[PDB]
Amino acid sequence: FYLFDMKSFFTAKALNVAIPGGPKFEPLVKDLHTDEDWNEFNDINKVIIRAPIRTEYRIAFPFMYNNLISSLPVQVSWYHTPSVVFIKTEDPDLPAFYYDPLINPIVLSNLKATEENLPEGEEEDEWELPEDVRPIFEDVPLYTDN
Amino acid sequence: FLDCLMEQTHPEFYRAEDADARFTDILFIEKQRGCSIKSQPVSIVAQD
Amino acid sequence: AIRHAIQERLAVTLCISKIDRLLLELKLPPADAYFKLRLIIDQVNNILS
Amino acid sequence: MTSVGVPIKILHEAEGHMVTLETVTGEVYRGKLSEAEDNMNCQLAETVVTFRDGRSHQLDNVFIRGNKIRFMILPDMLKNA
Amino acid sequence: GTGEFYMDCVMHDMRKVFSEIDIKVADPVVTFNETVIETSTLKCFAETPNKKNKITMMAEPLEKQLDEDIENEVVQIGWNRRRLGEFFQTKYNWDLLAARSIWAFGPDTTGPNILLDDTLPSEVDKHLLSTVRESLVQGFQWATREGPLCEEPIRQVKFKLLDAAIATEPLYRGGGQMIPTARRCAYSAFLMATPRLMEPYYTVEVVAPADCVAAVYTVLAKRRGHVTTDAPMPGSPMYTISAYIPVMDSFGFETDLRIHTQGQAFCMSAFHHWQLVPGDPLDKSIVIKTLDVQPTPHLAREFMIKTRRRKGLSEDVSVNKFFDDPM
RNA sequence: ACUCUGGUUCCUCUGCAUUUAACCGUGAAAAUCUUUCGCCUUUUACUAAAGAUUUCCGUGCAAAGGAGCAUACAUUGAGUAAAUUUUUGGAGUCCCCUCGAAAGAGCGGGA
Numbered sequence: 001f002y003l004f005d006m007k008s009f010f011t012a013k014a015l016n017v018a019i020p021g022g023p024k025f026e027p028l029v030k031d032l033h034t035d036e037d038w039n040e041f042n043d044i045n046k047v048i049i050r051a052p053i054r055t056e057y058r059i060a061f062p063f064m065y066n067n068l069i070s071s072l073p074v075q076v077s078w079y080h081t082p083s084v085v086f087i088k089t090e091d092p093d094l095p096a097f098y099y100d101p102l103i104n105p106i107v108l109s110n111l112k113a114t115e116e117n118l119p120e121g122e123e124e125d126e127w128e129l130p131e132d133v134r135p136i137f138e139d140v141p142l143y144t145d146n
Numbered sequence: 147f148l149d150c151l152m153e154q155t156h157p158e159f160y161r162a163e164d165a166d167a168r169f170t171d172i173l174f175i176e177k178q179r180g181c182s183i184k185s186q187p188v189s190i191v192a193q194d
Numbered sequence: 195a196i197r198h199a200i201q202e203r204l205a206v207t208l209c210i211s212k213i214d215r216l217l218l219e220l221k222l223p224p225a226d227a228y229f230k231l232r233l234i235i236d237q238v239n240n241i242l243s
Numbered sequence: 244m245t246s247v248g249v250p251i252k253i254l255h256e257a258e259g260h261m262v263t264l265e266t267v268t269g270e271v272y273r274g275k276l277s278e279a280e281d282n283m284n285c286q287l288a289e290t291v292v293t294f295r296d297g298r299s300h301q302l303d304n305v306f307i308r309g310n311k312i313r314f315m316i317l318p319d320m321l322k323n324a
Numbered sequence: 325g326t327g328e329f330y331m332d333c334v335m336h337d338m339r340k341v342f343s344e345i346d347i348k349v350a351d352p353v354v355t356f357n358e359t360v361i362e363t364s365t366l367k368c369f370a371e372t373p374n375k376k377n378k379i380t381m382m383a384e385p386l387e388k389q390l391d392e393d394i395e396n397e398v399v400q401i402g403w404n405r406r407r408l409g410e411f412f413q414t415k416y417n418w419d420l421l422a423a424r425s426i427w428a429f430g431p432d433t434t435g436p437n438i439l440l441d442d443t444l445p446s447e448v449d450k451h452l453l454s455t456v457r458e459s460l461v462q463g464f465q466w467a468t469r470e471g472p473l474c475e476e477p478i479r480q481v482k483f484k485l486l487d488a489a490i491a492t493e494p495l496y497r498g499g500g501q502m503i504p505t506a507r508r509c510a511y512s513a514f515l516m517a518t519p520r521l522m523e524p525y526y527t528v529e530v531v532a533p534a535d536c537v538a539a540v541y542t543v544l545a546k547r548r549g550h551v552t553t554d555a556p557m558p559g560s561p562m563y564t565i566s567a568y569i570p571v572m573d574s575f576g577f578e579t580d581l582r583i584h585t586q587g588q589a590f591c592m593s594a595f596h597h598w599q600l601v602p603g604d605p606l607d608k609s610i611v612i613k614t615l616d617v618q619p620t621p622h623l624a625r626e627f628m629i630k631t632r633r634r635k636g637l638s639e640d641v642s643v644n645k646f647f648d649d650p651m
Numbered sequence: 652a653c654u655c656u657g658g659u660u661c662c663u664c665u666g667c668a669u670u671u672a673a674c675c676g677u678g679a680a681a682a683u684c685u686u687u688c689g690c691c692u693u694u695u696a697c698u699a700a701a702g703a704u705u706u707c708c709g710u711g712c713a714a715a716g717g718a719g720c721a722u723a724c725a726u727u728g729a730g731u732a733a734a735u736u737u738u739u740g741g742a743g744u745c746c747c748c749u750c751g752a753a754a755g756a757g758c759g760g761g762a
């Protein structure tokens with residue numbers, strides 16, 4: 001719903017512009033056409049144009065790309081949400097936790113492996129965990145059919 | 147993450163079950179944009 | 195952020211956040227989760243070195 | 244950790260502050276409590292020792308064994324922790 | 325400011341927090357810089373208005389990444405001359421004799437330009453030249469602050485002073501004589517050295533799934549950016565695409581990218597380097613009729629001319645206003 | 652050791668649900684007034700935007716009372732159950748010099 005969400009429709013209505021496929025409304029300020037002022041601040045000779053400031057950018061960044069925004073009820077949309085990567089399982093026979101082949105393998109070709117400062121020497125290999133200490137859910141299965 | 151430290155040190159601090167509290171995003175534009183825009187300090191006493 | 199901290203002579207320390215995303219979104223087996231965590235630590239130490 | 248009585252917990256919060264402690268032999272050591280232990284062994288940095296005759300020395304570090312401490316004077320603010 | 329989302333917040337605070345008035349906002353642009361891509365062919369002289377002193381300079385392209393070292397203060401002009409000289413001879417393999425002879429960075433103490441004293445001490449004595457040194461440095465920093473093409477700061481130019489007739493007496497070598505004349509010498513050295521513009525480039529990191537990579541290139545191609553790495557994110561389905569894009573062509577890049585991928589791509593952009601605007605900015609064979617986006621060899625001519633129009637300068641560099649004809 | 656109470660389900664009353672970025676409502680009506688657009692020989696019924704108020708279909712929690720069902724005393728606020736170096740199973744006792752009527756006190760000394 002980037003630029004097809006509630007706040008972007010509000011900004012489009014406020015700016016009197018329309019998102020392709022969005023709703024279209026009667027002009028909120030009836031005379032925004034008055035930018036035909038021929039003042040030098042807007043002068044097409046002085047501006048450098050590379051890709052035209054199309055209305056998506058006016059909605060995406062309402063305050064950098066528009067005038068009058070103290071009188072216009074322009075609204076910020078939520079900027080980004082970190083994209084969810086849950087892939088739906090096709091097969092009920094798979095484990096619930098399995099390395100799906102759409103997940104890239106965990107490798108990088110040229111990283112040095114970090115130094116593992118493990119305990120060493122004869123006195124330290126003999127260290128034993130007591131007989132009752134046991135992983136916190138050892139007998140619980142890692143996953144069920146649910 | 148700071149929301150958790152806030153929740154631990156402030157008994158009345160509310161975290162929604164389904165939205166981040168973002169206590170340190172105090173600006174309303176940070177509330178709306180959903181991202182931290184300006185740094186906010188938080189001084190707390192915490193036990194190790 | 196790591197490089198700028200070292201330049202400013204700050205003590206760099208690491209939190210590997212959002213580890214639930216391994217369990218719940220990626221669904222990596224716990225063994226493959228360890229390699230994913232390890233590689234993040236390796237990537238960070240590649241910067242420090 | 245496992246529970247331990249409030250006096251020992253307060254002693255661990257006395258770490259990093261100045262403290263004064265008297266040993267069973269009577270000498271008074273004032274210093275900065277750099278470490279404490281659950282048996283209340285104490286390491287004092289920056290120490291001043293006062294003998295019972297009133298003489299004194301500076302000492303750079305002292306370790307005092309816990310069961311040889313008679314009492315300590317902690318700092319005041321620990322009554323709020 | 326640093327990017328699109330920065331200005332959007334700065335302007336939001338200007339609208340809703342601080343100013344509470346109506347403000348016109350221009351279309352965003354970038355500051356350019358000016359550079360020379362070639363060694364100055366003539367050596368260029370500037371006589372002081374009293375016709376007694378005679379500065380001579382040349383200009384060169386500055387070697388790769390030395391400007392980043394100056395700007396990041398990896399080297400500082402305030403260092404002691406041995407330590408300063410040690411850096412240039414150790415890291416950039418400079419002649420030791422040259423490394424002693426740096427006179428300034430410019431247009432400020434961290435600016436991406438060097439002035440050198442290449443004056444050999446047989447032609448003028450080192451003491452007399454030392455009397456005008458501070459004026460020459462100050463006119464060089466004046467020149468590099470404005471710059472002759474479109475009054476944008478000069479960067480990555482190595483200016484060498486290499487001759488100086490100087491008057492025997494102070495009243496004929498005053499600061500007001502020397503300071504304007506060092507600027508005219510720097511500008512004449514610059515315009516002989518094949519001048520060019522520089523624009524800043526972002527470094528863009530895109531994270532997108534596998535099918536959105538062809539979109540990333542498609543959106544870059546419309547904006548002159550290019551992809552320098554395309555690697556899978558390990559332990560993830562997404563890919564990481566790294567690209568350089570001009571800042572000048574980045575306005576709406578993030579928005580174009582997200583729309584053409586339905587937000588499955590997202591990207592973030594930081595300044596990375598200054599790279600030449602393509603083309604020759606002084607090529608009068610190119611006319612900037614404003615009907616359409618100029619093709620890429622004309623960009624340096626457009627960016628220069630319209631920056632002059634914006635700043636209220638004359639339409640075109642009257643390059644021969646600085647030179648002597650038999651120079 | 653004190654006073655404190657039976658679970659459930661339902662009905663109804665009362666009070667509160669304004670520091671709104673935003674949300675009593677993951678849904679979505681109607682009216683009035685003021686203003687501006689379009690229909691139009693007038694008004695009603697209208698167009699479609701703004702602002703200000705209303706009504707209506709709903710919501711949450713607390714508290715009180717009642718009504719049905721099958722039935723259990725604990726439990727809330729206030730407050731219970733280790734002789735081997737670091738504390739709770741004894742390095743303890745006794746004897747001279749000093750100040751002082753008087754009884755202690757010195758890193759005092761001795762067994």
Ligand SMILES: Nc1nc2c(ncn2[C@@H]2O[C@H](COP(=O)(O)OP(=O)(O)OP(=O)(O)O)[C@@H](O)[C@H]2O)c(=O)[nH]1
Pocket residue numbers: 081082147166168180181182183211212213214215
């Ligand atoms: N899965 C998962 N998501 C999390 C976790 N913590 C935060 N998030 C989500 O990640 C997003 C960002 O969280 P933020 O707290 O805003 O992170 P942030 O780094 O402060 O954002 P900025 O400060 O603006 O850079 C939100 O959508 C959170 O819901 C987590 O622990 N696990």
Ligand SMILES: [Mg+2]
Pocket residue numbers: none
């Ligand atoms: Mg009538």
